[PDB]
Every structure is written in structure tokens, then in C-alpha cells.
Amino acid sequence: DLPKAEVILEPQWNRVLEKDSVTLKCRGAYSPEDNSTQWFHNESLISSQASSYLIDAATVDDSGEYRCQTSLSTLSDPVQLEVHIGWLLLQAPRWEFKEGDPIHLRCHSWKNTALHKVTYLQNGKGRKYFHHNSDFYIPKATLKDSGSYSCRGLVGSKNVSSETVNITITQ
Amino acid sequence: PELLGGPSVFLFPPKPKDTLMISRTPEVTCVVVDVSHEDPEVKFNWYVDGVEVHNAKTKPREEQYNSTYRVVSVLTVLHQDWLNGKEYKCKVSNKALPAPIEKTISKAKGQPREPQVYTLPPSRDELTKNQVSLTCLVKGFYPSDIAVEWESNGQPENNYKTTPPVLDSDGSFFLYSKLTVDKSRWQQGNVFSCSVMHEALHNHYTQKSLSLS
Amino acid sequence: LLGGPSVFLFPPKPKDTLMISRTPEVTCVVVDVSHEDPEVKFNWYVDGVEVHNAKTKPREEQYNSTYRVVSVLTVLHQDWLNGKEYKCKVSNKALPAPIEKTISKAKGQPREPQVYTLPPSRDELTKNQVSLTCLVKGFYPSDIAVEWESNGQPENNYKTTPPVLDSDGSFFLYSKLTVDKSRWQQGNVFSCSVMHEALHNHYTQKSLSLS
Ligand SMILES: *[C@@H]1O[C@H](CO[C@@H]2O[C@@H](C)[C@@H](O)[C@@H](O)[C@@H]2O)[C@@H](O[C@@H]2O[C@H](CO)[C@@H](O[C@@H]3O[C@H](CO[C@H]4O[C@H](CO)[C@@H](O)[C@H](O)[C@@H]4O[C@@H]4O[C@H](CO)[C@@H](O[C@@H]5O[C@H](CO)[C@H](O)[C@H](O)[C@H]5O)[C@H](O)[C@H]4NC(C)=O)[C@@H](O)[C@H](O[C@H]4O[C@H](CO)[C@@H](O)[C@H](O)[C@@H]4O[C@@H]4O[C@H](CO)[C@@H](O)[C@H](O)[C@H]4NC(C)=O)[C@@H]3O)[C@H](O)[C@H]2NC(C)=O)[C@H](O)[C@H]1NC(C)=O
Ligand SMILES: *[C@@H]1O[C@H](CO[C@@H]2O[C@@H](C)[C@@H](O)[C@@H](O)[C@@H]2O)[C@@H](O[C@@H]2O[C@H](CO)[C@@H](O[C@@H]3O[C@H](CO[C@H]4O[C@H](CO)[C@@H](O)[C@H](O)[C@@H]4O[C@@H]4O[C@H](CO)[C@@H](O)[C@H](O)[C@H]4NC(C)=O)[C@@H](O)[C@H](O[C@H]4O[C@H](CO)[C@@H](O)[C@H](O)[C@@H]4O[C@@H]4O[C@H](CO)[C@@H](O)[C@H](O)[C@H]4NC(C)=O)[C@@H]3O)[C@H](O)[C@H]2NC(C)=O)[C@H](O)[C@H]1NC(C)=O
Ligand SMILES: [Cl-]
């Protein structure tokens, strides 16, 4: 038998906002004879035959499972993509962490619109502040880093926030 | 005009008086500011207690000194609906926005309360002057939507100011209206009246008089 | 307008400026101060003239993780009342240029308030509680303080309207003291105290009781 292909996301974020570009890149081995890659979105076959698949401007309809397959691979396990609506989205490489892991949160704004006076909340309490937008790093995770998390700031003069998201810390 | 956050919406109540007299037409008013020239198109949807209504009337755009458009939509409400407590939702959609803005307005909530209307003559110490102060105390009312006017011998008296409502220790509201007239007029024995209109008054109206003795 | 700390500048209380027993102050409040750039320098100016007597507290972190810092300048009663200007210039690694803010008493020919107490209306004596009114009109500027008192104790249960711009450019307000009807019938004596710069010794009172 034959190894299964996998779908890679560039950028890596499993959650994105409408209008975000996202590139799905299929990785397996091709045959000499067959240069193609087939793409599924949920149950639908995507007509493009490309090595990698572009969602230039994401919509909520782009949400779901994505799989790919390459001329010398089995079909890929599915990869999940959630297109959210709004001004701000809290992005992270994932949401469960072991004690000691690094945590990298991003306070992504719709169309990269410049955001200032940015605060990252944990459990309804502002935790870290930046004057200009910046990612927030906890290089050594711990029991206390568990909670609900959001970010907010100002887009020009208007006040905005992300949906809140739970983070868990395991052993 | 940079406009990083796109438009903003402000939603307004009808004038207290238009809700209280059938003769008049109460309106709710949705005002969109900061509409860019680049993406000028604005679309309203209106909802009463959650159901979409279609009878609203949108005005054409207005260029402002700051170089942004202002766009206004006006929905006529039924007298009974406003007073019966219905929720008005204005939903506004523009390409500068990731999602529509929704604003809701309704009459204030709470058991209504009848205004007490007390009129008061000048302090003795004021009779020194060429002008005296005729005072109308209106208290113990809920909600704060009210209309207070003055008149004499049928005609409305022009020189008066009414303070805005003030929240009193018991949850109700009160205000004062001062009517300024000549000393002669008051001593000449003339009859003056404080007209109050409020939802809790029998027939939305009461009228107290004031004069010398 | 595009991100960094932020400055608020606050006038003294009208009472502190009017009464010689008190000490008025201007207060310069800086918020939204990073932990990464945390040192904040204030320069203070009276009618253009730098001054050095401000008392500036060390910075306190808020619930929201930002730093806040306050500078307090004591004012001369007469400097305030004569309309001098107070300027707070704030500076920080995070600021493209310093931020300056300015305050002063409001400008214009001051007018003396007329103070008139007015007794409850005839009809109100039905109720178990009545309204003693205190009308204060013809005053400029709008800065004012109005209290009530009886037999040496102050009276608690009153509400005073905002000033209202009157048609001659003066301001007026009303303050409504509420009292049990019994107290009014017994013949007790209530006072409207009023403080305002354009009054003699910045103070006057009219009294009110039954006939
Ligand atoms: C992170 O946290 C901090 C801390 O916040 C506080 O704690 C948390 C838990 C929250 O609960 C929060 O609600 C708390 O406030 C945040 O810091 C705040 O930041 C905001 C801005 O985003 C500030 O907002 C301005 O507030 C002004 C009102 O401030 C007073 O009133 C508020 C509440 O009503 C109080 O909380 C403040 O403490 C201020 O209170 C006054 O403080 C004075 C100084 O102590 C007192 O006077 C002194 O008193 C002493 C003795 O008591 C003597 O008497 C002294 O002599 C005297 O000097 C005074 O008594 C006191 N009054 C009280 C308690 O009533 C608003 O005025 C201002 O509005 C203007 O500017 C806005 C621009 O943002 C704009 O929206 C408005 O339109 C308006 O703009 C102006 O328009 C007018 C028209 O009339 C024009 O004339 C003006 O020129 C124009 N511009 C300007 C610049 O004026 C703001 O809303 C807030 O004050 C501040 N709080 C504190 C405590 O510092 C921080 O934002 C958080 N940030 C983030 C990103 O998370
Ligand atoms: C670019 O220009 C436009 C046009 O501006 C105009 O022209 C320029 C050249 C200048 O001259 C301006 O001075 C001039 O305004 C700007 O548009 C303005 O934008 C600001 C905000 O940026 C709006 O502020 C809001 O104002 C409302 C009250 O507005 C009424 O009263 C005004 C004067 O007081 C009047 O100008 C308005 O037209 C409006 O008038 C009413 O109109 C209705 C409908 O037609 C009519 O039936 C009424 O009779 C009439 N009334 C009167 C008295 O005339 C104010 O309520 C808003 O405050 C809320 O929001 C603030 C933050 O947004 C917040 O701080 C306050 O706390 C308050 O929040 C509310 O608080 C209450 C309780 O207090 C709470 O219950 C509410 O839920 C809560 N609401 C919210 C949303 O939080 C706000 O201040 C102007 O109205 C708007 N003006 C116009 C004419 O459209 C634009 O800002 C400029 N853009 C840039 C980038 O510079
Ligand atoms: Cl300078």
C-alpha cells in the first residue's frame, strides 16, 4: 500500500476572517506520468488540479474539511478551516498545551486594518497591553495560563473585540 | 478623511410629544455617519419586535465639511406600538464593514407614573425687579418623556426655559420650567398656565394655572 | 491619533476655588502606559510660565494591565478666578511628540446669582412629603455650588438640576429639597446655601419656613 498525503496551511491558522488569503498546499509524492493533485472541500470535488489550492478572499462558505491527494498517495486525512465573521480574531497554533510549552497568540484584524491600544484579556482581565498591534508570547506555559481569552483594541476611533476562546493546560 | 473603522450608526427616539398626540407623526431615526466616498452605498433593514418592516424612507446622501457622507433613514412608528413597548431595530450594511451594524431602540421600561404638576409664584424678594419668575414643578413621573409649555389668555408665552428631566431619589423624574414675565403683567392679575403632556396623564394632558392673591 | 499613552486634565472643584479654607488643584492624568516604556515626565505651565511645585505620584498598574500616573498642581485661588491658563505637557519614549493639554476658568463677564426660595404649592400639602424649592438665576459662569441645611445639620434629601442656559446668556438652576410634611408644618427653618465667584464673599443664603 501507499502513504497518505497531507494538507498544509499557509499561513498555518485554522481560524481565519472573511477576506483573509489562505493557501492550502498538498504534500505527497507524484508519479512521472501524473502531475495532478485532486482537492476536496467537505464532500465536493474542487475543480482546480493544482499542487496547492488558493482561497484568495475567504468566505464563510469556504469553512469545512479539506483533503488532497496526489498521484502516488492515498487520500489525505481531513484538515479543518473555520472562516469567522468580524473585526478581530484570536489565532493560535492550537488551544491545548502541556506545562512548559510555548504559546503564541495573534490578535488578527479584518484586512490587516491597523489596530492600536491592544489588550489581551484572560478571564475578563486585561493581561498584556501594546500601543501598536503585536503577537503575545508565553514561552513557558503553566497551570495558571488556563482560562478564557480575547483581545481588543481600537481601529481608528472605533472600539472592537475578538470572540473569546478557551485554552486548556494538561500534564 | 482616513476612516479605518468604517461607518458608525446612531439611532434616535421620536420626540416625546409626537408619541403622545394622535394628530402628530412619531418617527424613529437611523443616522449613518463616516460613509466613505469610495464605498458610498448603504442599505437599511428595519425590524419591529424582530419582524422586518418595509415602510421606512431613506434620504439621499449628504457631503459634509469633513468629506464623508451622512445617510439617514426614517421609519414612522405607530403611536400604540411605541407606547406598547416595541423594539425598533435598525440594521445597516456597508462594504467598509465586516458585518452590518444593528442598533435597537425602545421606550424606556418600567411601570409608568403620573406627573404631579405644582405651579409656584415669585418669591416675595423678586417683586423688587422689572421681571418676575413663574415656576412649574413637575415631579414623580416615569418614563422621562414629557412636554411642558406655558401659556396665558390662550396664547403661548415665549420667554420660558424648562430644565431637562432629573432622576429623583425614588426612581421617578422631575423637572422645573421657569417662565419670565414683566412685574406689571403679574400684578395686572393675568392668568398663566403650565401645560404638561405625559403618557400617564388622563388623556395625556393636564394643565395647572397660576395667578395673584 | 495612532497609538500611545493618553492624557486627561482636570479643573479644580468650584468649591475649592471659592473658599479660602480649601485648596484647589489641577490634576493631570496619564493612562495607557506600557510596561515596556514606563517612565513619564510632566512639565507644567501657568500662563506660559513653567512651574516646579507639582506633586506627581509613582505609577499604579490597573486591572487592565496598563500603568496610570497622576500629577497634581496646587493652584492659587486668585489665579484660577482671574482666568489663568494651566498647561500639562506629557512626554514618553512611546510619544512622537509631547502631548500638551490646557485648562482655564470659562471666559466672560461674571454675573451675580439672584437666590429665591419658594415654598411648597398649595396642592402638595395633600402628600406626606413636600417640596421646598430654591431658584438661582442670572449667574455667570455656570460654576456653582448649592447646598441645603436646617438647624445646623445639613439636609440630605435634595436634588439640583444642571445649569440651564437662559435667554439672556446667564444661567439658572433649581434645587428641590424634600421634607416630611410634619416638619414643614412645625415651623422648621431651611436654608439654601449658595457659592459663586460673583457673590460677595463668594456666598449667600436665603431662608424658608411656614407663615
Ligand atoms: C485601562 O484602565 C484605565 C483605568 O480605568 C478605570 O478603571 C477601570 C477598572 C475601568 O473601570 C474604567 O472605567 C476606569 O475609568 C483606563 O483609564 C481611563 O481611560 C479613559 C479613556 O479611554 C478616560 O476617559 C475620559 O474620562 C473623562 C472623565 O474622567 C473622569 O471621570 C471618570 C468617570 O466618570 C473617572 O473614572 C475618571 O477618574 C475621571 O474622574 C475625575 O478625576 C479627576 C482627577 O482625579 C477628579 O477631579 C479632581 O478631584 C480632586 C478630589 O476628588 C480635586 O477636586 C481636584 O482638584 C480635581 O482635579 C474628578 O472629581 C473626577 N470626577 C469623577 C470621578 O467624577 C472624560 O472627560 C473624557 O471624555 C472626553 O474625551 C473622550 C476622548 O476619549 C471623549 O469620548 C469625550 O467625548 C470627551 O472628549 C471631550 O469632549 C468635551 C465636550 O464636553 C471637550 O471639552 C474636550 O475638550 C474633549 N476632549 C478631552 C480630551 O477632554 C474621557 O471619557 C478615563 O478618565 C480613564 N480613567 C481613569 C481612572 O484614569 C484606561 O482607558 C483603560 N484602557 C484600556 C485601553 O484598557
Ligand atoms: C464627520 O462629520 C460628521 C458630521 O458632524 C457634524 O458636522 C461636522 C462638520 C461638525 O460640525 C460636527 O460637530 C457635526 O456633528 C460627524 O458626525 C457626528 O459624529 C458624532 C460621533 O463621532 C456623533 O456623536 C453622537 O451624537 C449623539 C447625539 O447626536 C444628536 O445631537 C447632536 C448635538 O448634540 C446633533 O449634532 C446630532 O445630529 C444629533 O441630533 C439629533 O438628531 C436626531 C435625528 O435627526 C433628532 O431627531 C434629534 O432631535 C436631534 N437632537 C439634537 C439635540 O439636535 C450622541 O448621543 C452620541 O453619544 C453617544 O455615543 C458616544 C460615542 O459614540 C458616547 O460617548 C456617548 O456616551 C453616547 O453613548 C450613548 O450614551 C447613552 C446614555 O448617555 C446610551 O444610552 C447610548 O446607548 C450610547 N450610545 C452609543 C452609540 O454608545 C454621539 O456623541 C454625532 O451625532 C454625529 N453628528 C451628525 C450630525 O451626524 C462625524 O463624527 C465626523 N467624522 C469624523 C471622522 O470626524
Ligand atoms: Cl512648550
Residue numbers in the entry:
A (entry chain C): 4 to 174
B (entry chain B): 232 to 444
C (entry chain A): 234 to 444
Quote the study on this structure.
ADCC is a cytotoxic effect elicited by immune cells, such as natural killer (NK) cells and macrophages. Fcγ receptor IIIa (FcγRIIIa) governs this response by engaging immune complexes (IC) to these immune cells. Upon binding of IC to FcγRIIIa, the immune cells are activated, leading to the release of cytotoxic molecules such as perforin and granzyme. Herein we have addressed the mechanism by which the terminal units of galactose of the N-glycan of IgG-Fc modulate its affinity for FcγRIIIa.
